[PDB]
Amino acid sequence: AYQLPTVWQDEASNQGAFTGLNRPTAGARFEQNLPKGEQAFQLYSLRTPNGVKVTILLEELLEAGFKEAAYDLYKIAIMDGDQFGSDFVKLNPNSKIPALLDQSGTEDVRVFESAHILLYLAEKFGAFLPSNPVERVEVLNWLFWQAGAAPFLGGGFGHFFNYAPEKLEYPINRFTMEVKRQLDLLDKELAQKPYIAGNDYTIADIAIWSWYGQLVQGNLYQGSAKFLDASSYQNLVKWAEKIANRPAVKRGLEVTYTEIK
């Protein structure tokens, strides 16, 4: 058995692919000058569940006729430490993608947290978020929900199922049970409504689809759809298939990134 220390020390445990990148301290580790284009929106991201949220919304907005949603899109390679460069830390001191710079105003505005970026864009354009104050509250409920729930899917289930050097029974059981409760929840809501927060497709759908929709379609962690009995959540599956077939979702998944070095 393990003797729990009275004060924790970093004794470099092997945490899988992110060992060396994961640290108990925050901050920039090297000077980095990021490229910047001419469009209003400079998006510093990666094709991941969080990153596709934002490229899906931007493509949906473009598709809806909002041509002022044109963006430049740069690859921050988080397996390479790019998120620790000084210019990226200026955009998001948390060193995570996505981070958005909006240089459209008179002052540059940094926007981070994927769910926040969804909100910020939706409010800016008045689209994919209902104007009706009551419908709006219910959309935000699910948006914030996603923000609070995804860590258990990504940081818990994902990490212990896919990344950790050893399969560990008790944490796998704990996060698997939780992810299944989240999938049952979503499935039971989608049994009653065409979209997560009602009758229309919104930023809540985008936020949740990028994680849970891709998960049930078998496009997240290898072997996870089987493991989680994904095809059992048939309301969620059907909603995810519908979304996957939207032309802007396809584009928001296929858009290509500009390198930073």
Residue in this structure with the two tokens 């940081």, named with its chain if needed? 155
DSSP letter at 160 equals I
Q: Is 159 in the site for a second copy (CB under 8 A)?
A: yes
Q: Is 229 in the site for a second copy (CB under 8 A)?
A: yes
Among 34, 78, 139, 240, binds ligand GSH (CB under 6 A): 78
Query: 62 or 140: whose CB is closer to a second copy?
Result: 140
Burial label for 131, CB within 10 Å (0-12, 13-18, 19+), is exposed
Q: Is 21 in the site for ligand GSH (CB under 6 A)?
A: yes
* Nearest to 230, CA basis, from 192, 183, 191: 183
CA Rg value for the chain: 19
H helix and E strand count, the chain: 10, 4
Q: Closest separation between CB of residue 80 and a second copy, Å? A: 18
Task: Tell how strand 41-45 and strand 71-75 pair up.
Answer: parallel
What does the per-residue mask of binding to ligand GSH show for 35-54, with x meaning CB under 6 A? -------------xxx----
Site residues (CB under 8 A) for a second copy, limited to 108-147: 109-113, 115-116, 119-120, 134, 137-138, 140-141, 143-145, 147
What does the per-residue mask of binding to a second copy show for 166-205, with x meaning CB under 8 A? xxxxxxxxx-xxx-xxx-xx--xx----------------
Closest-CB residue for ligand GSH? 154
Query: 7 or 79: whose CB is closer to a second copy?
Result: 7
Contact 120, 203 (CB under 8 A): no
Burial label for 3, CB within 10 Å (0-12, 13-18, 19+), is exposed
Residues that bind ligand GSH (CB under 6 A): 18, 21-22, 48-50, 78, 83, 95-98, 113-115, 148, 150-151, 154-155, 158-159
